[PDB]
Every structure is written in C-alpha cells, then in structure tokens.
C-alpha cells in the first residue's frame, strides 16, 4: 500500500491535472486509455526539463538552474516560450491541491526506558541502550 502510494500520489495528481486541462479544452468524459496516455506524456515532460536544464547548468559549471537555463532547455524542445505569459493569465484555469502528506502525522509516540544493562566500553553512549 505505502510504496504504491509513494508513486501513485504523484501519478494521481498528474492524472487530475490532465483531466482538468481536458475539461478546460471542452472534453467531458474521455476514453480511459487516452488519459493514461496524456498523463504519461506529462510525467515524461517534467522529467525531461529536469534532466536537460540540470545538464545545461552543469555544463556551465553550476549546480542549480536559473531562468536562462530553462529558456534554452525549452527552446531545445521546441516550445516557443513567448506564448507562456498569455497562457498563465487564463480565466478558465483550475488549481489542483497537492497530494495529502502522511508526514504531517510523522510521529505518534516517542518514549524511553530504564533497567537496561550498561554499555560495555567497546560500545559508545550514542548507540541504542541495551533492552530489558
């Protein structure tokens, strides 16, 4: 369940993003194989600006990418970057809230115990205590 969820939370958000862009277009009720196709092209697109803008900045001896490394990355994917300020200011756009995180409930209960036998001198104090 949790290992599936690690991958699935981030894929299901991608699928909801795809469904929302399809609705904005005009499509209501799409084919099932056409949604897992388009959300596979969406994950492969975020993973390709991840690998290529990291490659363009590290070619210039840097470690984190600036704006000038992505506007050359998107050019090498054929994007026509200038049309993006008009796309961001739509009136039809939605906002998909991010997948819920189990980290907020990170720790239910933490406690200590006594009567554990002492550490021998080949075990330092920072190792866990000997049990009951």
């Amino acid at each position: 369940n949790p290992a599936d969820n690690y991958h699935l939370a981030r894929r299901r958000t991608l699928q909801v993003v795809v469904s929302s862009l399809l609705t904005e277009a005009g499509f209501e009720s799409a084919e099932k194989a056409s949604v897992e196709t388009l959300t596979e092209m969406l994950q492969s697109y975020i993973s390709e600006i991840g690998r290529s803008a990291k490659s363009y900045c590290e070619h210039t001896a840097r470690t984190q990418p600036t704006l000038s490394d992505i506007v050359v990355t998107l050019v090498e994917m054929g994007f026509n970057v200038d049309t993006l300020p008009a796309y961001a200011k739509r009136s039809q756009r939605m906002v998909i809230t991010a997948p819920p995180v189990t980290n907020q409930p990170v720790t239910p209960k933490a406690l200590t115990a006594g009567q554990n036998r002492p550490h021998p001198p080949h075990i330092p104090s920072h190792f866990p205590e000997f049990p009951d």
């Binding site: 894929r11 299901r12 469904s19 009720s29 799409a30 596979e40 993973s47 819920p100």
Partner: protein, 412 residues
Amino acid sequence: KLKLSNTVLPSESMKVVAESMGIAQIQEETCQLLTDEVSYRIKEIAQDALKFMHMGKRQKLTTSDIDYALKLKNVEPLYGFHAQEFIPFRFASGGGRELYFYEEKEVDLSDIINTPLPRVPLDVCLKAHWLSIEGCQPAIPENPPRLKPRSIHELSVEQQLYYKEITEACVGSCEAKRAEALQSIATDPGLYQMLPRFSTFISEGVRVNVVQNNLALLIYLMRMVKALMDNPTLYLEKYVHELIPAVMTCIVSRQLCLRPDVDNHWALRDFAARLVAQICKHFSTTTNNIQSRITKTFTKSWVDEKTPWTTRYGSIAGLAELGHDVIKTLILPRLQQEGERIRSVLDGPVLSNIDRIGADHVQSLLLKHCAPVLAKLRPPPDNQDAYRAEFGSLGPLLCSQVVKARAQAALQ
C-alpha cells in the same frame, strides 16, 4: 534434469496487428519472422532488467527496471507513444500506462477530479536497534521471533518478577502504569509460557471479585483480557475455556455494590464484556461449539421469566452485539414481551430499587438495535405511525434515528 525451452509470442497475434495496420496478405514465414525477432527483444530486455533488480537489491522486478533496461539498449522508455524527432522527450520515462485487462475503457472526466488523492507516505528515516547482544538475539519487536532432584519453576526470576510487576500494575493503582502494562501484554512476543498463570489470575480474580462487586477490579481485568487477545504471537484457544466464563459473568451478573451511579460504568462493564465476547466468537471458531453455546445461554437468559434486571440488561447487550443477522433473526418475535416488562416497571411505584434504571437502559438499547434492523431491510416510507403496529415503542424517534443513519450513509 533441465527441460528448458524457447517460448516465443504467438504468430496469430502478429497477423492481427499487421492487418489492423494496412499490411494485408502476409505469409506465415513472413509472420513467423516477426515473432522471433520481438520475442528476442523481450528476452534481451528482461534479462537486462534483471540486472537492475539485483543492483537495487530487490527480489521483485518493478515497473521502473524495464524503463532503465530500455534506456540502456538506446530505446526510449516511452511505451504509449513514439516520437520520431525524439526532442520533446529524450529517453525520459513517463512511468508507463496504468491500464488493465478488466478495465472499463471509458470514464467520466469529473470522476477523476472528485476522487481524493492518496496520502504521500512518510519520508525515509534511520532507526537503530540490536540484532545481537554478545551473541544472543534479543526478542525486541524489530527482531522476527534415592531422592529425585529438586525441580525448578519453568519461569525465570526475571520472568517471574515481570509477571509480578505486570499484575500489580494491571490492578490499576496508577493509570499510566496500567496503560503501559496493557501495551506490554498487547505486544510482548515472549508472553507465551507465562500465559497459564495470566489466565488463572484473570479467572480466579473475577470469581472472588464478584463475591463483592468491585467494579474497577473487574474493569481492569476485562481490559487485561482485551490486551491478551490482540497479541498476535500467543496461542489463546487453549485458554479460552477459562476466559469465556469470566466474561459471561461480567455481563450476566448482579451488582453487589451500589445499584445506581456506577450502573453507567456497569453498562460499560457489560459493554466491554460484550465487545470481547463477540470478538471471542469471531475468533476460535469451529463447528457448533463456542458461538452457538453462548448464543443458547444468552437466549435462555432472555426467555427466563422474572429475571434480575441487571442480568436482563447484560444479556440483552450480549445478544445485541452479535452482528448483522443475529438481531435480524432473534430480536424479531420478542418486542411484545419487552414492552410488557417496561409497562410493569412503569406501573409499580417502587422507585428505590434498580428495576426502573434497568428497564430504561434495556428499552433504549433494544430501540437503537431495532432502528437499523429496520433501516437495513426496508425503505424509509411511513415513518410516522406504522411502527404502532410494533407496539409503538420507538416510533417517530426510531424513524429519526433511521434518518440519522441514512445521513451518515450519504456522508460515506
């Protein structure tokens, strides 16, 4: 002995693909030529995806192993589409396509939006424990599992001291001590081979603890029983013949201490006892021994004339918590008797006895059970005065309880 073969994909699947593309009239030698080439590439990749399984230290080939095995053979990991130019996605895995054989092949586009997203699991943390203490593996939860000679007890003195501390903590002088001792009972792996002495301490305790009706002593022992049951390591159905008559006694017995006031707890003593009773009939089940035996004792407790009303209330609760069908088949032909008992308590002036309190509790519990028993097997039509055909006990208030249940179902 090794009868290893060479299995290829069927050729009658390759002609279906060819004629659904525009390439008709293909020969069999042309079609067999396709299915040994592609069956080699599947065998070449699955042998190459097994390298990433071993390197990642897993025994299960995940879906991402084929994405790296394809990228290793200079083929794009993309499965759904193929980009001739290759510039929009260059050897970038899109994680495959979540498709099934038994799928619907058409969904509504607002069904995918309105479903709740799955919970992102916890991040990776580093906890340390002990596999071995100077050669011996500890039993912590991070680990898997002519004169005759003077004999020794089968418990150690650490184990006997542990038993004494756990039993003196489980009699509830301090609440934090109880709660740890209850969790210690609930998850000690080595609590077998001490379990006869725990079962005997429980059984013997309730029987000399109902001589004077000491409610805490009993509420603590029932919590000890509940903590004994949910422990997964120990084998309990050798000891359930002592456990079950102890809980029946908590539910079907009279209270020697003050009748009112703690009757609220007494209902919970009968609530905790009926919970553990139906949990014991859920487990340990063989043919016609345990569940039917306690069902028969509960029914002859019910049909017995002129009962103690404490015993009556406890047995009513016990028969009530037995599940879906049990109240569907048993509480049905008895509403008139319940109503007559309520009417007798009402008429007789006697108020200083416990009969009136017992009657009110029994009627409330029976009315709640009857409400869903009704919500479950009929529509909610005519909820005003049709229940007057069932002596008019809960009537419109029963209908309101059914409506609240329907609202909870709508929320679900």
